[PDB]
């Protein structure tokens, strides 16, 4: 299959130069914008640092593929597998501390060096594994073959069963949290609006007392979901402070004066409630779109570098087109990250157009 090794490396070099240009662009936008540096920003920055560590040496892979076999020494190939390994596990543990920080930000420097140390531990465990096995007369560089296999198996078990299921648990918790918080603002605005129409239709059979008790329960929940913080709570104290005023007059049978206090229900609803329910809706919709960036960079890191890794283990423990289609997938992920940032990430789309119009 000479045409496979003939048509990989020009594509490899183009995704290499595109990835290194895009990631060096990412680091000069951090080098200019050092003010709003969030924890997400520095974690994806360390992911970018691992990406430019991986990004320089795809020409070595390209001229290894172009000659038909490996050219340099075995230590060079061990270094190449080591830097691919620190790229993979740096991405894994950086998304893991991303899950850490978004859990402790939504649900309720040193760790970057910890991520680098775990990466270099992975680099050592793939340093002791790699050797150029010249099988069938071709000097390829594939890791193949008692305590080392068991150590690799337990490291795989830890670094697959803990962080992947941790991603599943934390991201399902977030998308069941931020969807339910947006849902809780929907029925609270619904029964504050629907039952106000029932009150104006409640001259028939005294459905006034049944109606405001539904609004008494809903507007207590919306109060539970700083000078600006004082105005948020105070806008609901007069809202249900005129619900019981229209319930005191509902107990005495004054239905006509209950409707007179129902006209004051809409006044506080527009001047205090509709202002802050929309303001809470825009902030909630802003944080649910930043999750969509975090979800996309996680789910494509497991759709690109993971199926190439699961085909490396089965070919080492013991169909070449299945190997070939995976060997272009994980290496594509170095350049694929800045592609996903402009068309999904709403923050990066702002300063990218600002740089183009500088």
């Amino acid at each position, epitope marked *: 299959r000479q045409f496979s090794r003939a048509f990989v490396p020009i594509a490899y070099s183009l995704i290499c130069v595109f990835g290194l240009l895009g990631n060096i662009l990412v680091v000069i936008t951090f080098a200019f914008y050092k003010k709003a540096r969030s924890m997400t920003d520095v974690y994806l920055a360390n992911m970018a640092i691992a990406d430019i560590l991986f990004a320089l040496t795809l020409p070595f892979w390209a001229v290894s593929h172009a000659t038909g076999a490996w050219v340099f020494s075995n230590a060079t190939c061990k270094l190449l597998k080591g830097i691919y390994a620190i790229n993979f596990n740096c991405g894994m543990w950086l998304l893991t501390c991303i899950a850490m920080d978004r859990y402790i930000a939504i649900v309720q420097k040193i760790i970057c060096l910890v991520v680098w140390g775990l990466s270099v531990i992975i680099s050592s465990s793939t340093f002791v594994f790699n050797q150029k096995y010249n099988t069938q007369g071709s000097d390829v560089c594939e890791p193949k073959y008692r305590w080392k296999l068991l150590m690799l198996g337990l490291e795989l078990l830890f670094g697959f069963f803990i962080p992947l299921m941790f991603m599943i648990f934390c991201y399902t918790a977030i998308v069941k949290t931020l969807r339910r918080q947006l849902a809780d603002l929907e029925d609270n605005w619904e029964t504050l609006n629907d039952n106000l129409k029932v009150i104006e239709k409640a001259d028939n059979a005294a459905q006034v007392k049944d109606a405001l008790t539904k609004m*008494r*329960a809903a507007a207590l*929940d919306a109060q*539970k979901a700083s000078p600006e913080m004082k105005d948020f709570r105070h806008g609901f104290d007069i809202l*249900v402070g005129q619900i019981d005023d229209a*319930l005191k007059l509902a*107990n005495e049978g004054k239905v006509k004066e209950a409707q007179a206090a129902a006209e004051q229900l809409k006044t506080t609803r527009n001047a205090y409630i509709q202002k802050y329910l929309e303001r809470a809706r825009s902030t909630l919709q802003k944080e649910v779109k930043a999750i969509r960036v975090i979800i996309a960079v996680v789910l494509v890191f497991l759709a690109c570098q993971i199926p190439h890794n699961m085909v490396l283990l089965v070919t080492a423990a013991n169909i070449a087109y299945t190997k070939t289609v995976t060997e272009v997938l994980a290496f594509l992920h170095c350049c694929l990250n800045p592609v996903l940032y402009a068309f999904i990430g709403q923050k990066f789309r702002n300063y990218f157009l600002k740089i183009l119009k500088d």
Partner: antibody
Amino acid sequence: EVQLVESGGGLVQPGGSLRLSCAASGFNVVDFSLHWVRQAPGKGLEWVAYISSSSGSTSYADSVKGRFTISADTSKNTAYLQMNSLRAEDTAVYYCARWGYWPGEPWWKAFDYWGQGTLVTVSS
Amino acid sequence: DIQMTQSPSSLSASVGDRVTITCRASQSVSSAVAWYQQKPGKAPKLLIYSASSLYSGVPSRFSGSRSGTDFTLTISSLQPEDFATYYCQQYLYYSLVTFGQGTKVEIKR
């Protein structure tokens, strides 16, 4: 401390009348709504009535509407519950509890301080 | 018109056990549910207010939680003084307070 006592409990005939007192010391009636909670002997608690002294709003439960009369007196810091036509299900212990006013945290502390209540038994 | 159903009618556990009592409202009652403890021959005492905040004076072993319209009182460590009757109550309005059926916590034997 702030506390509430009750009085006026005893034995009446069916169809009779009885007025329980509820004396509150340490706090004013105009700052806290006053409730009567009824516990039948061996059965669960049941709310009966409330009076709001500032706004003059009184309300009753469905089993005691018309037969029961609640009132308050800020001069002696007392609340009175007057009952007429006491039927055979009305023998129970009556507790006098306080409750805060909206807004703020005293509305959330529902029935924080209770009285010991009085036994009202009806029989012929 | 709001009915609260207390699910355990009689509850039996010994000293040191963790017990839970659940109550369910008919409609939404927001976070306005209180939990009362009544010893036999005495007035009830307020334990939990606003379904999560323990009262100033009660011990810290009593806790409350809300899940929609399902309210839960949990005692982590039972004591000899903890054997009494427990009532759940919605307090959405002054004229709509309804109490639960009651849960009697006896001694496991």
